[PDB]
Design an enzyme around this catalytic site. Sequence first.
Site, short mmCIF file in Angstrom:
data_model
loop_
_atom_site.label_atom_id
_atom_site.label_comp_id
_atom_site.label_asym_id
_atom_site.label_seq_id
_atom_site.Cartn_x
_atom_site.Cartn_y
_atom_site.Cartn_z
CB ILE B 19 -0.99 0.03 1.19
CG1 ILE B 19 -0.26 -0.01 2.54
CG2 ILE B 19 -1.96 -1.15 1.12
CD1 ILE B 19 -1.19 0.07 3.75
N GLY B 20 2.17 1.18 0.01
CA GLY B 20 2.99 2.39 0.00
C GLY B 20 4.48 2.10 0.05
CB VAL B 27 3.50 0.69 4.14
CG1 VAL B 27 2.36 0.31 5.07
CG2 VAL B 27 4.40 1.72 4.78
CE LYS B 42 5.55 3.89 8.06
NZ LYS B 42 6.10 5.19 8.54
CG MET B 102 -5.29 4.36 10.75
SD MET B 102 -6.74 4.43 11.83
CE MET B 102 -7.46 5.99 11.30
CG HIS B 104 -10.14 5.53 3.04
ND1 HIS B 104 -10.06 5.00 1.77
CD2 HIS B 104 -11.30 5.08 3.58
CE1 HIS B 104 -11.13 4.25 1.55
NE2 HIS B 104 -11.89 4.28 2.63
CG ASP B 145 6.84 15.64 6.56
OD1 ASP B 145 6.16 16.48 5.92
OD2 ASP B 145 7.49 14.73 6.00
CG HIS B 326 -23.84 3.75 -11.38
ND1 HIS B 326 -24.97 4.54 -11.37
CD2 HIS B 326 -23.80 3.14 -10.17
CE1 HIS B 326 -25.58 4.43 -10.20
NE2 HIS B 326 -24.89 3.59 -9.45
C1 LIG Z 1 5.57 7.86 4.00
C2 LIG Z 1 4.13 7.62 4.31
N1 LIG Z 1 3.68 7.86 5.54
N2 LIG Z 1 2.35 7.56 5.53
C3 LIG Z 1 1.56 7.72 6.74
C4 LIG Z 1 1.96 7.11 4.31
C5 LIG Z 1 0.56 6.69 3.97
N3 LIG Z 1 0.39 5.26 4.03
C6 LIG Z 1 -0.28 4.63 5.01
N4 LIG Z 1 -1.59 4.39 4.81
C7 LIG Z 1 -2.32 3.75 5.75
N5 LIG Z 1 -3.62 3.53 5.54
C8 LIG Z 1 -4.38 4.17 4.49
C9 LIG Z 1 -4.45 3.36 3.22
C10 LIG Z 1 -5.18 2.18 3.17
C11 LIG Z 1 -5.25 1.43 2.02
C12 LIG Z 1 -4.57 1.83 0.87
C13 LIG Z 1 -4.66 1.03 -0.38
C14 LIG Z 1 -3.67 1.04 -1.34
C15 LIG Z 1 -3.82 0.27 -2.48
C16 LIG Z 1 -4.95 -0.49 -2.63
C17 LIG Z 1 -5.90 -0.45 -1.64
N6 LIG Z 1 -5.78 0.29 -0.52
C18 LIG Z 1 -3.85 3.02 0.91
C19 LIG Z 1 -3.78 3.77 2.07
C20 LIG Z 1 -1.67 3.35 6.94
N7 LIG Z 1 -2.10 2.70 8.09
C21 LIG Z 1 -1.01 2.63 8.83
N8 LIG Z 1 0.09 3.19 8.24
C22 LIG Z 1 1.45 3.29 8.76
C23 LIG Z 1 1.46 3.91 10.14
C24 LIG Z 1 2.16 1.96 8.73
C25 LIG Z 1 -0.33 3.66 7.02
N9 LIG Z 1 0.42 4.28 6.11
C26 LIG Z 1 3.08 7.14 3.51
S1 LIG Z 1 3.18 6.66 1.85
N10 LIG Z 1 2.91 7.94 1.01
O1 LIG Z 1 4.52 6.26 1.58
O2 LIG Z 1 2.10 5.77 1.59
#
Ligand SMILES: Cc1nn(C)c(CNc2nc(NCc3ccc(-c4ccccn4)cc3)c3ncn(C(C)C)c3n2)c1S(N)(=O)=O
EC number: 2.7.11.22
Lengths: 248, 329, 826
Positions: B19-20, B27, B42, B102, B104, B145, B326
């Site tokens: 997801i990131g 992540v 992570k 989390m 979104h 940040d 839709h």
């Molecule tokens: C750096 C960095 N710092 N941050 C906080 C993020 C966001 N990324 C993140 N998003 C969490 N959830 C939201 C979420 C849920 C589902 C999807 C998804 C993606 C693809 C398909 C379906 N669904 C995307 C986002 C989340 N929950 C906990 N963490 C951390 C604390 C480990 C999270 N980090 C990033 S970045 N930009 O590298 O990402």
Amino acid sequence: TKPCWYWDKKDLAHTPSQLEGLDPATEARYRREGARFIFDVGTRLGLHYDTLATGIIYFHRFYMFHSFKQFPRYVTGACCLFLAGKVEETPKKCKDIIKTARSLLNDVQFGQFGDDPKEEVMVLERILLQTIKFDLQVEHPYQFLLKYAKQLKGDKNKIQKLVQMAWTFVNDSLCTTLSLQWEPEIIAVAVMYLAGRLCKFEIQEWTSKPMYRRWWEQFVQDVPVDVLEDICHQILDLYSQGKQQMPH
Amino acid sequence: TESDWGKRCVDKFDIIGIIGEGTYGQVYKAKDKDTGELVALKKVRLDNEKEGFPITAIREIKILRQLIHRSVVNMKEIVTDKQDALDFKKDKGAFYLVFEYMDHDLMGLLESGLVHFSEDHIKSFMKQLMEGLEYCHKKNFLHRDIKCSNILLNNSGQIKLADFGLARLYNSEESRPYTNKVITLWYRPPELLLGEERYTPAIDVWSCGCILGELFTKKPIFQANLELAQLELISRLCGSPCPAVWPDVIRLPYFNTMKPKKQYRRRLREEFSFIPSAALDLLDHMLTLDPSKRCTAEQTLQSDFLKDVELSKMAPPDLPHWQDCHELW
Amino acid sequence: MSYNYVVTAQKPTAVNGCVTGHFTSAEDLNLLIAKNTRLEIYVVTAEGLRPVKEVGMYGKIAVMELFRPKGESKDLLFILTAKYNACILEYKQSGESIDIITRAHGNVQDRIGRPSETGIIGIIDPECRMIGLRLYDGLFKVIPLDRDNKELKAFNIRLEELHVIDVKFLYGCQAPTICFVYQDPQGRHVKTYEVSLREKEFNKGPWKQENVEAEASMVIAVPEPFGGAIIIGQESITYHNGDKYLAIAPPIIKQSTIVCHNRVDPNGSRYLLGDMEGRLFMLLLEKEEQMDGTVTLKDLRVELLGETSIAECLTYLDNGVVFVGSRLGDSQLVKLNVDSNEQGSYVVAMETFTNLGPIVDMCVVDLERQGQGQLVTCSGAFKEGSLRIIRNGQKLHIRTVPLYESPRKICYQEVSQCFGVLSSRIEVQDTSGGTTALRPSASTQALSSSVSSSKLFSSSTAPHETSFGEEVEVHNLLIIDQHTFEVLHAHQFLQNEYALSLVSCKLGKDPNTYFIVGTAMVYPEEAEPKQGRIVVFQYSDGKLQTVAEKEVKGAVYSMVEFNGKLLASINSTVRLYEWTTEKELRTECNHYNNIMALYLKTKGDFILVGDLMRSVLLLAYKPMEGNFEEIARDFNPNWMSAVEILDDDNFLGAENAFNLFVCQKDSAATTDEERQHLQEVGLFHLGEFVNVFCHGSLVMQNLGETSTPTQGSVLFGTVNGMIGLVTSLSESWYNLLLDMQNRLNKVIKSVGKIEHSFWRSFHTERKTEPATGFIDGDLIESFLDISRPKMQEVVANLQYDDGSGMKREATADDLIKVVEELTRIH
Ligand SMILES: Cc1nn(C)c(CNc2nc(NCc3ccc(-c4ccccn4)cc3)c3ncn(C(C)C)c3n2)c1S(N)(=O)=O
């Protein structure tokens, strides 16, 4: 939630080092020498006193879970200081710690680092982190010695002499397992207690409760006078054994 | 026990997908096999061995084990790759920081345009972020940040703050030398643009104000790719930095070097006339040029806009989801 | 990096707006018709419409109003693009040569503002003192029409009423007065303001606020003889002017929502109203004069005339002719006659204009086996629903199959010489407790018919409450012959079952060819549906047989055949089913890391997933293990409308913001991290909403066709009817054509002085980026239409590269041949 980092004196007869045939005197002296290595190395590098203490606390905790015969103390010490720098935001490059360690160690001692000193240290970081259970935040007697002293009012020079003498005792308690027996708050009180006895000061008079013989109770609750004496005895033993005498 | 971190293996989590990717490692979204609880992992790679374990990860491990708030993300544990047996040196496996999952992230919701925010919705969002920011500022920690990219939201309306990779302690008595390029440019405080390098907790307040405006327009207030263009945009809205509004602006390293085109007057209330009067006053104070005159986190909690908001009423944001899947005839 | 080429095969056919005025000359009557990115000028005669000119703009036209300021012989035109590019245009004709003059130009976008829920609203003062624009909530922007404002500079007036439904300038006011309907928590109200150019603010309006219908939709400025305004709602029509107030609530208008108004009689005695069911009404103003001579409004009356197309905008063309601007079906010219015909209608269709309508889905099929593709498109909605067969007959030949209900998806089953079509029709809750269809349609006029008897969700819990008059959708599967295009069979799905996906294929070792439909059970309370079916049908001997059904826990948005297995997306889940020897679908492997898996595409063992908010993911089926693997995801937040796979490494996506992007695997295996990162190498603003991507080309293939520089062919359909082709280029050809664009940009004159780069720039509210990796075929194919002096000016200092010769000078004749080869792809 959070781990327990305090043992009983009786438990130190059963560290991994003890059970591999190391006698109590040897482990205890090795702890002083290892702690002092961390202290001296970081002092040469100009590190904040908290950074030195954090490394020393990691070091002491480490050898509650491993034996000195399988992990060279100085490599561990260098690794502890390395990590401590990053934790306390006083970072140093591993190559500089090795450089300083080589300056202060003889040829036999530096042999522990083996053929590649940096590697032996960097590799150990993994084990260190798992060992201390990733509980990186550590509190030290220093902050409580100042927080409590600030609430003392009276003769400025008498209180400052108390602080420095106690501060010296804190630095000396880092060579001992007291860091593993008592929370830092008690240590800060104990050193104030000790300095008061040596300087013939009656600290209660400077507290907000001048008729409260137990000044420590307003700082640290549930502290028997007994605890403070056990701590004082151990600090004084270090001074009696060495050639150095009480600072006064 | 629950406290012996770093030993339990990552086998215990069933990975759902990536997801990131940011800061140190990627992540992943996972489900605990034993409990079925969704978690986010992570990966922390120490194989580089330039400086071993990343300090960005060390900060996030150290701070987030201290901080306990519903508006700050939880680190449940840390777990490890199957480690090499009897070969501690050969072992190059990575660690996984286990967080609560989390649903979104704010950016994606605003970017896809799939989220509409009412006044009541905006209150709950900001109230939690401030509750978190206040809790952190009271513990003398600075996030440094704040971004839409790392304000996280559950469908229930629960907000949590997340990217503590750059977070550090602040000492009021002993100001310390710091890193100037700390908050991302779109959310950067004017003070850091001009080289302050000795930052107050106010830097995080400025970002949250930018978000506040971003919740009414759905666009970051100040967007630029250059440190001086940002100052120009901020100056047009908040007024050009001048000794009258910022007495100590002269002490800044790059005040003489970096000057806006004009000495613009403040227009915030005019350009944001569509914002409700209670929020507009909050924005005016959060987006104050002088950090010493900039409002605190607690003061935002004690504003007509946020003080009397109730946690019991979650007020979840509206997501069309299937409705807009839709096209609407 | 990736290099692609986009060309428009069919221009947009939908009508966005219409005004009539004396633009070309005060003597001529002109109808100006607006299609997305296109302006059409006509001279209205009693005999018909004669086109004078057709102009193209670098922008989506949002506001268009005609005004004649004092001192001009002819009306001038104001246009505002959706990107906030504004311009004033004037007609100029010298003999055979026609030019459109840009008198004023400016971008009115504000640094800070909230887009209005109702959107940009544009109006012009009756005295042409100012142009009124409501671009953002809570702000009213004024462009004063002074002779010196050649840059269209403007100022904003703070507006207390944040949520404004509609606004118009009023007639007969001492100072410019706006009348508007706004919404606050207490309901909807009508209010007036006066605009002071000297003070640059509002002053108290001529008449007080009145509370109006909750669904008041449109504001009408009535001309000088009456004055005031008319407010059109769902159930009531009201006239407001100071102390005067008249309200008529006929029962006929309640049946369908009215969304357009046009003035028939210049003095305001008649207005034309249209509704979503196509009925055409007339709001008549009955005059009552006092002995003083003051003309007052006596009463309002509405009279049904007949049926027209659903009109986004209406225009009366003098004589009796009325142009019907339709976005959902064919536009029309209709005459309102004084005597009704034997059916009771006063409306008789005169001229009909082909509109491909919303293209919900499409497939390319070689019906005649002539090595040429035919594009059968699901076009239109409701009564205007149709199947449109399009071939490159040189002009395009379009055949229309009326359906009178909404088509959703289309697939072709050659084995059965037929097309499978998913359709939905609107019925209304009636007094019987059931529903009644407003009109007969394809699903009701099929030769044979069947209705699902599935017992899967029958038990449910308890039926939800139904109120008479409420609308419901009834979904069907239509079997349509490929030659006659006659509805052979109609299968009605269960009550409250929405059909979303359709495929035709063989599965496993089963030799039978099936129609497979994926449905979702939509309940009004459910934010996201939690029940669905995958149904296997067999069309055999004129009858459709239910072969097997699979119950799923969600909406089957998209399905696709995957190497003898069935790949289906149920909500967040992507699933692979095996077809057993017992003729029943069996799950094999699943992937759950999605928000809503709306779109699916496959090449080999690779799957491309499009998501409502998380952009595109590249999946892979690993046969050794029997499970999915995530190859690479696009981590930029994009809201998808359609996706396609260009090649094993390039993937194409369409955004809801009218933008197109191409993502490629980072092709760098250093770190697993880089491979997992899909990188957006191509960004391009199309200006159209792409609903469907389909591989194939309509051009005749004789096996003799010169091999064009472009390789590959992806056709796409849009909501405004536009059909376009996306094809790939070599790096050498892209640079050649890109360098040529930059040369064309300086040579070709843009209407409104709009920078071409800005128009094609990837634009979202939050982010704006320059186009990359895409060649605008339309700009290139216009090289063949510029004058010879301009042609030679373009080719000056041009060098071919990476080819047979490293540096080669280009001539104007050489490029003419090259571009003409590019015009052969569409
Ligand atoms: C750096 C960095 N710092 N941050 C906080 C993020 C966001 N990324 C993140 N998003 C969490 N959830 C939201 C979420 C849920 C589902 C999807 C998804 C993606 C693809 C398909 C379906 N669904 C995307 C986002 C989340 N929950 C906990 N963490 C951390 C604390 C480990 C999270 N980090 C990033 S970045 N930009 O590298 O990402």
